[PDB]
Amino acid sequence: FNLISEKCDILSILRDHPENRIYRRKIEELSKRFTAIRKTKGDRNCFYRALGYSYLESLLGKSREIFKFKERVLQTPNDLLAAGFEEHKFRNFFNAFYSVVELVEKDGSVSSLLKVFNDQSASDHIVQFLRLLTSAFIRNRADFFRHFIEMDIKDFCTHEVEPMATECDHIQITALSQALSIALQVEYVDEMDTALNHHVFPEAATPSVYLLYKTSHYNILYA
């Protein structure tokens, strides 16, 4: 469980910031709305790895939702082609993502999905696929995404989306959310004496996924 941990009680993360009055206050508050947390490895890939595991976990046992999601995933090679990616360069990464979607449909267990996301090879192939699809979705809508941002859209995707270990901002979150129709809520826990607060992507949606952002790092929350 070195990439995505077991579930733990929400108050188990007090020990990560002992004798820090603001962190203690905000974690206590968070515990009133959320029961449990899973931790991710902090390797620069945590947003992609967390979003993928948590969203696919949320599908388990939901046959119409899984069918509709698989239909969208089967079309994603066209997004990549339209942005200038070549099929022989993305095939290995697309096949790894399609394989874990089929595991959600056919096996259906938490334990099998956790095993794939803790297998360094399978899990890093999955993250690289998600980074290429984020890039493609931004490139194909450059006039729409100009406004979050490298001056050039193209330079930004080359440097800050496609490479492994590159950190995210609101543009990557919004783009991957839109590319896969995943509704997500991000809770923000910083060191300033401010309200605990959150953002929903997109604004009007009922989220599937809840993440905790603290110390430039994303962990998974359970409501």
From 58-66, 78-86, 90-98, 209-217, give the range in contact with ligand J5V by CB under 6 A: 209-217
- Per CB under 6 A, the list member of 10, 13, 30, 46 interacting with ligand J5V is 46
- Per CB under 6 A, the list member of 1, 9, 24, 43 interacting with ligand J5V is 43
Do residues 34 and 223 make contact, with C-beta atoms less than 8 angstroms apart?
Answer: yes
For residue 110, give the nearest of 207, 220, 12 by alpha carbon.
Answer: 220
- Per CB under 6 A, the list member of 3, 45, 76, 125 interacting with ligand J5V is 45
Q: Does 217 bind ligand J5V (CB under 6 A)?
A: yes
From 29-37, 45-53, 63-71, 134-142, give the range in contact with ligand J5V by CB under 6 A: 45-53
Q: Going by C-beta distance under 8 Å and a sequence separation of 6 or more, which residues neighbour residue 181?
A: 69, 72
46 counts as catalytic: yes
Q: Going by C-beta distance under 8 Å and a sequence separation of 6 or more, which residues neighbour residue 119?
A: none
Q: Does 169 bind ligand J5V (CB under 6 A)?
A: no
Rounded Cα–Cα distance for residues 179 and 23 (Å) = 34
| H-type alpha helices, 14-161 | 21-31, 46-59, 63-82, 87-106, 110-118, 120-139, 142-145, 153-160
Q: Does 17 bind ligand J5V (CB under 6 A)?
A: no
Rounded Cα–Cα distance for residues 204 and 140 (Å) = 24
Determine the residue with CB nearest ligand J5V: 42
Nearer to ligand J5V, 45 or 177 (CB): 45
217 counts as catalytic: yes
Residue with tokens 């069918």: 67
Q: Which residues are catalytic?
A: 43, 46, 217
* Residues of this chain that bind ligand J5V (CB under 6 A): 42-47, 215-218
